[PDB]
Design a protein around this ligand. Sequence first.
Ligand SMILES: *C[C@@](*)(O)[C@H](CCCNC(N)=[NH2+])NC(=O)[C@@H]1CCCN1C(=O)[C@H](N)Cc1ccccc1
Ligand SMILES: *[C@@H]1O[C@H](CO)[C@@H](O)[C@H](O)[C@H]1NC(C)=O
Ligand SMILES: [Cl-]
Ligand SMILES: [Cl-]
Ligand SMILES: [Cl-]
Ligand code: NA
Ligand code: NA
Ligand code: NA
Lengths: 30, 7, 255
Amino acid sequence: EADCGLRPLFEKKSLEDKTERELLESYIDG
Amino acid sequence: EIFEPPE
Amino acid sequence: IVEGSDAEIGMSPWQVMLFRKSPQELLCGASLISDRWVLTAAHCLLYPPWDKNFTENDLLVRIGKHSRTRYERNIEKISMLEKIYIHPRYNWRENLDRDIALMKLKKPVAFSDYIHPVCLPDRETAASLLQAGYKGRVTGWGNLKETWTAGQPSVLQVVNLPIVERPVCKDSTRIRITDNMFCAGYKPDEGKRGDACEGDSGGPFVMKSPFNNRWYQMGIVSWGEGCDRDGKYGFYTHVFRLKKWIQKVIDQFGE
Ligand SMILES: *C[C@@](*)(O)[C@H](CCCNC(N)=[NH2+])NC(=O)[C@@H]1CCCN1C(=O)[C@H](N)Cc1ccccc1
Ligand SMILES: *[C@@H]1O[C@H](CO)[C@@H](O)[C@H](O)[C@H]1NC(C)=O
Ligand SMILES: [Cl-]
Ligand SMILES: [Cl-]
Ligand SMILES: [Cl-]
Ligand code: NA
Ligand code: NA
Ligand code: NA
């Protein structure tokens, strides 16, 4: 749906949660 | 446990 | 959730609680995928070896919650169910293959800071993200420790876990695995811990796409043996694999 997956209190405010970087790290790091 | 009710 | 932490407020605004009306009971988790549709595990609704067969009138959904037991005034929304739809090839007799159900709400729910739908994956997303070692996130108000091990969280729990390769999942259990499932969690030699548990079923396994910054639901908490055991892994319903069923139901029965 058009606006799915963007969280009003995080993505929509350019704020990151405490552990989301851990996910991204897993996708990039060796 | 115990759930708080609405309202 | 075992060995996770407290969620931040609004961290998982698609989290849904399935709640039994009478007697009052948290049954399982669920996820919000549009204003009228909630996704969950079929075994939460139908599991005849334990005499479980809930109808629409037996249940409510509670959306926008953080506290497990408090009534969150002006934050949570309570919705009734119009209709439950269970995968016609859900196999409760053997291995919970296709352990997937949709519930249509009676009325659309209004979105808010605390309530907001998760994306379902398209083929490119599933292919990019469904790789061994890549991590997703699992949320739920299920047990804090293995069942019998004796318990419940005060607030919603969150753990991040890596996808595990098929041969490792397959060799981990004598339950027959299918391509409609995947497993996640740390190997013994990786040191770190974490697992979903009883009462977490139906909650989402989500991954954040670096292509568009959106959260996608890749998995549904489905089953496991104990929780957080060395050499065991939690199993999840493979959502992209069942997406054609999901779409079929929404197309026919939506508004
Ligand atoms: C319904 C749930 O909340 C729950 C999720 C368990 C998640 N566990 C871990 N460690 N990630 N699922 C169940 O309890 C399902 C319902 C049927 C029994 N079951 C199991 O997980 C059993 N413990 C194992 C099993 C038995 C039969 C068929 C498949 C799995
Ligand atoms: C479950 O309930 C419905 C009606 O409430 C019924 O049609 C179905 O056969 C029931 N039992 C089982 C085991 O599915
Ligand atoms: Cl309603
Ligand atoms: Cl066991
Ligand atoms: Cl609809
Ligand atoms: Na960050
Ligand atoms: Na049912
Ligand atoms: Na484990």
